[PDB]
Design a protein around this ligand. Sequence first.
Ligand SMILES: Nc1ncnc2c1ncn2[C@@H]1O[C@H](COP(=O)(O)OP(=O)(O)O)[C@@H](O)[C@H]1O
Ligand code: BEF
Length: 182
Amino acid sequence: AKRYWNANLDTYHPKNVSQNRALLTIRVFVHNFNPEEGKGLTFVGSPGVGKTHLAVATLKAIYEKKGIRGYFFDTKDLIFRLKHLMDEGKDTKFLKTVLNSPVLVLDDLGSERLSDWQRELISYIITYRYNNLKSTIITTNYSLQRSSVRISADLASRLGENVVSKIYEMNELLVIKGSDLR
Ligand SMILES: Nc1ncnc2c1ncn2[C@@H]1O[C@H](COP(=O)(O)OP(=O)(O)O)[C@@H](O)[C@H]1O
Ligand code: BEF
């Protein structure tokens, strides 16, 4: 939540061409934002590059220029939460607020390997937000370096083809290639 208390599109000073184009693409996005269009952004790249930074920035910028309140979740944290109240039987209120949210950030989306019930929820949340035009921002890890449909096949390996296909329709892809990480 608030290790990025200071993550503004203003505190952001791009450190290369990649980070600069992302910033301009975000500013255009935040400016032209209709929650009824269900368009999001997808941030890909290595660790320390600033993906989560820009995702939190985008979430705030939307809220400070459009007044639309969204949510930031770590994907694993969101999944563990839900799986609990899924098999506790009595909290749907949290699930609806997540699914029906105008803006949702899925941070570190299934970066590693996931169990069947984790793949169940991810596919569920994304298909719902795909069908009901609910704008959703994603940050994800890309392994091998040098290859864009590989950002899709590498993602599809741990999420499935169906999901990555829908992620590609709704979102614009922004690769971030900073070096030296954090
Ligand atoms: N252009 C930038 N300006 C200021 N701080 C940055 C920038 N890029 C990254 N950071 C900081 O570096 C740290 C790691 O970045 P992070 O967003 O977590 O990268 P990733 O999510 O890709 O791992 C964060 O604390 C973030 O605030
Ligand atoms: F350290 Be990461 F790419 F959120």
